[PDB]
Design a protein around this ligand. Sequence first.
Ligand SMILES: CC(C)(COP(=O)(O)OP(=O)(O)OC[C@H]1O[C@@H](n2cnc3c(N)ncnc32)[C@H](O)[C@@H]1OP(=O)(O)O)[C@@H](O)C(=O)NCCC(=O)NCCS
Ligand SMILES: CC(C)(COP(=O)(O)OP(=O)(O)OC[C@H]1O[C@@H](n2cnc3c(N)ncnc32)[C@H](O)[C@@H]1OP(=O)(O)O)[C@@H](O)C(=O)NCCC(=O)NCCS
Ligand SMILES: [Cl-]
Ligand SMILES: [Cl-]
Ligand SMILES: [Cl-]
Ligand SMILES: [Cl-]
Lengths: 504, 513
Amino acid sequence: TERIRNVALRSKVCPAETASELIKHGDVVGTSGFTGAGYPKEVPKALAQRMEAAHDRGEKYQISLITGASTGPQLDGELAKANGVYFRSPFNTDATMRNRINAGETEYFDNHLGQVAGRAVQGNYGKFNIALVEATAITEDGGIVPTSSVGNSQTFLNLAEKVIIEVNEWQNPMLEGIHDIWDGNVSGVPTRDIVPIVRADQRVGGPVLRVNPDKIAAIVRTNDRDRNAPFAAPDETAKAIAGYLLDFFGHEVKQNRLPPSLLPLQSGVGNVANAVLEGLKEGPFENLVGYSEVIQDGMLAMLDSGRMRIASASSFSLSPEAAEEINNRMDFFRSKIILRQQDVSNSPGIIRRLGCIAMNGMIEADIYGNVNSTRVMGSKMMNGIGGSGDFARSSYLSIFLSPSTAKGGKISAIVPMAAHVDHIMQDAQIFVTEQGLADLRGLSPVQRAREIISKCAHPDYRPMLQDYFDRALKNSFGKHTPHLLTEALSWHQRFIDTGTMLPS
Amino acid sequence: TERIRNVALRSKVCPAETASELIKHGDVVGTSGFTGAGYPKEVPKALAQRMEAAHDRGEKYQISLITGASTGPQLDGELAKANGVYFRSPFNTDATMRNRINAGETEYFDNHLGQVAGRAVQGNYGKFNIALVEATAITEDGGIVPTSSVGNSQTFLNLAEKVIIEVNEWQNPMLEGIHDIWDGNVSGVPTRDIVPIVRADQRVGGPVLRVNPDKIAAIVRTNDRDRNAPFAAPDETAKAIAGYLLDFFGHEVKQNRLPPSLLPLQSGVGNVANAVLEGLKEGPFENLVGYSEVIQDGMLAMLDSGRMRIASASSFSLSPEAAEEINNRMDFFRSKIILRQQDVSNSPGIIRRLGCIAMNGMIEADIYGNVNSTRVMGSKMMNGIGGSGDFARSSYLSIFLSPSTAKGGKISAIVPMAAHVDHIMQDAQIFVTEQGLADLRGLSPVQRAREIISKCAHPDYRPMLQDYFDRALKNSFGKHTPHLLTEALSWHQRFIDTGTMLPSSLEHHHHHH
Ligand SMILES: CC(C)(COP(=O)(O)OP(=O)(O)OC[C@H]1O[C@@H](n2cnc3c(N)ncnc32)[C@H](O)[C@@H]1OP(=O)(O)O)[C@@H](O)C(=O)NCCC(=O)NCCS
Ligand SMILES: CC(C)(COP(=O)(O)OP(=O)(O)OC[C@H]1O[C@@H](n2cnc3c(N)ncnc32)[C@H](O)[C@@H]1OP(=O)(O)O)[C@@H](O)C(=O)NCCC(=O)NCCS
Ligand SMILES: [Cl-]
Ligand SMILES: [Cl-]
Ligand SMILES: [Cl-]
Ligand SMILES: [Cl-]
């Protein structure tokens, strides 16, 4: 079945190489792509090849690359390999690009995901020269059907001087209809419109991205794959975490602090998320609803088993097994999933209104419950803040989940002071490790410390943490949030120096 | 005239002392009060006396005190002097209470102001035993007219088992009508209502707080003043800061990145805020709008001149002279001002929709532009985060303003690493000091550092900052946000040990060579 259904636009089909020539040194390029899904593939590869050649000839050739969130080898990977990105935002997970970022070779800023569209419209990244967006199809009326994510694509299409569409035959034609694109003012010039979403399952828009056809400078026919999540399963640590959390949800429901169906759920991806979602798949809470950034393996299973009724997100993050699954029953799943613009999925106004329960991972927390989501030792980027701030601060309950240690026990995930802060105390109420659960609601910082140390810290590190806290209480400048500044970051330095946070 | 216009409720009138006896050791008490305005006065004073008397006999007597925001000497002050508060939230500016907090004698958590009502309804502070609310009047149908602030009063009235009202004749009767109290679900059980505010001058509710009259256990007639802090006349440092900011606004307008009427403005109080408000009064702008937490002297000034068309807030923060001005013209100013519940003034949904410009103070920022609003040396509370997070994160533009140094030059307000973080890099776009303005939009952390160091840091500290940065760039574990963990917090420790962040020349320092 022909994917370009608007006859007139078929005259704009051209090779990826030729399309890449539209992109000039210095350009700001906005692309589709979120959680390894729906990013352009072939034009970035052709661009990277030409960048390498240009550099070899002594010609500067770099772009600014703005996305939905993470992409894949074909985009972040190839461009990073070619040393062709001078600035990157807002969220990366590619190893080559991560290395460029941590070497200072590519400038990076990890904006709150739900804010990126608004900052782009404000001009913070500069004028968008190019929008490069992957599509499942182009409708007879010229609508652009998104692929496996929506992300920021509608905004990039609005802003960009020239538009390049990659129509990817690898993507399932039955994706058409799954997206919900609102034509209102979410991230434009103030005063913005009210987004009339009052339930997580509410569609308020249409199935296509809109663009003036005169702005389309090239369409490239492509055939290449998204990334997939690991198939791998929850270990003992993840299952213990899930166990503590589910017990907690049970007690809240019993105390009438949550409905029997809980509240709209926001979850991450990873061992821990899968375990939590796996836990819920067979849990005592029925008619669950998801209002999240991403559809992962865990949520897909519940939409399947009816334990979750519907899930809202901006993107997919699926294992090959899960992808195969959904691609076989798209007609079914398509009625249980809504893919929204990321400035809507991650809108704090909507998240607070719906009363979302936020469940997110973390690098580390300190004893006062400040959370680092991003920067190892305070300086080395992992992925980025993503939407964890959008959700943590706006949620009805903000929960953070992590193994109590990292790197085979050589790092404590509970530390005297976080080496970098992404989420302040006020934005984190509940902590869960395989050691236990700390409920911090209504507590002062010293009271938070008692709970975090006693409930969440690993036995190998707990006495050291308690020792730090007790001596801090005695010798700190102030006693409201006791610290010993000579020692606060010393565990991190110990790891840098010796490879472990444990004393010799 | 009679302030209690509901006849039945007059039977509940009693002395302050008697009313205070309703409050028991251990009680959670929610009160009116925000930026030193509209807090109860006589009952707290009586309570403090009875607490001190109990303590002298070896009898425990303490409460949990939950407020709108800051109060005043009669409340935070008296209770703190009496050591009568075991837990306090969400925001304090009283010096005695500050001392109790920093000594560990009063447990404290500074919640985001716009979230307090919601967390109270969720039960985070426990069950509310008492709501103690100051009123201008009580209407014929039993409505409670608030005074110089709204704060969290409607929420506290809903939650509390027993209610005590202080009817304060010092407060101008013409305050009645200035408030907008919504019965909508802003901070209740999900799903919440859409709060349908689409302009700063929009009223969505009515003039009174609502309470079941059966919960009213006591009404006390009072006559006592709010805490009207002296006007902080701008110094040269403040004027310089304001000048840079106003130049920046002017440029944004000339580049069509803001309209000539700017956008709804949120500002603070004090020296720098006053300088900015004076600058706004004289600048090349028109038809300004306030959407903030507070109404300050400079705002009245622009409402009078017509430069500002309306000012929305939860409270007043006026000097005695300004308080006098508004009292003799309350008829006029009541038409230009809307006082809202703080969970509405500080609603992230509304702040973002309106596109507010946020302008806030700070203790310090690090070279990467993370901001500390609260904890000196990382451990000693000043005031609290207040609504700075509500506004900073939700705003169209988030701006932080501060002198480049503190403590007569012995502290740098720009440091290698902040000792505590309230506002992450993502929540701060513009920094201004008397040295200049750093525009950080679209920059990576290393690029942020270049701008902050060059534009904002004091000449006495810039070389030391550049040295830290340069050596971090060469040695840091990662180079995305370069740090030297061995010395990141060393300037703070230096201040603790020596009373200054400036290094001695009797030992080696990398920037000296
Ligand atoms: C924090 C985050 C990296 C954790 O991911 P996770 O899969 O749940 O946790 P894991 O235990 O598997 O650890 C992931 C990686 O971080 C590393 N890590 C985790 N904690 C660490 C620590 N305290 N010190 C050093 N490294 C750490 C792990 O080593 C691992 O890296 P590796 O494979 O190179 O060894 C991840 O949640 C994230 O990037 N958060 C930011 C975005 C976000 O939260 N968005 C909201 C929801 S869409
Ligand atoms: C950060 C804050 C304290 C600054 O106050 P300010 O009036 O703007 O500026 P000041 O220079 O007068 O500083 C106030 C006090 O903090 C101290 N201070 C400021 N910076 C300091 C620093 N870098 N190191 C140590 N102390 C510092 C000052 O010495 C002063 O102390 P003092 O009263 O004992 O003399 C204040 O803005 C605040 O409390 N912010 C949190 C609440 C908020 O922003 N709400 C938003 C809407 S208003
Ligand atoms: Cl909305
Ligand atoms: Cl709380
Ligand atoms: Cl709303
Ligand atoms: Cl930005």
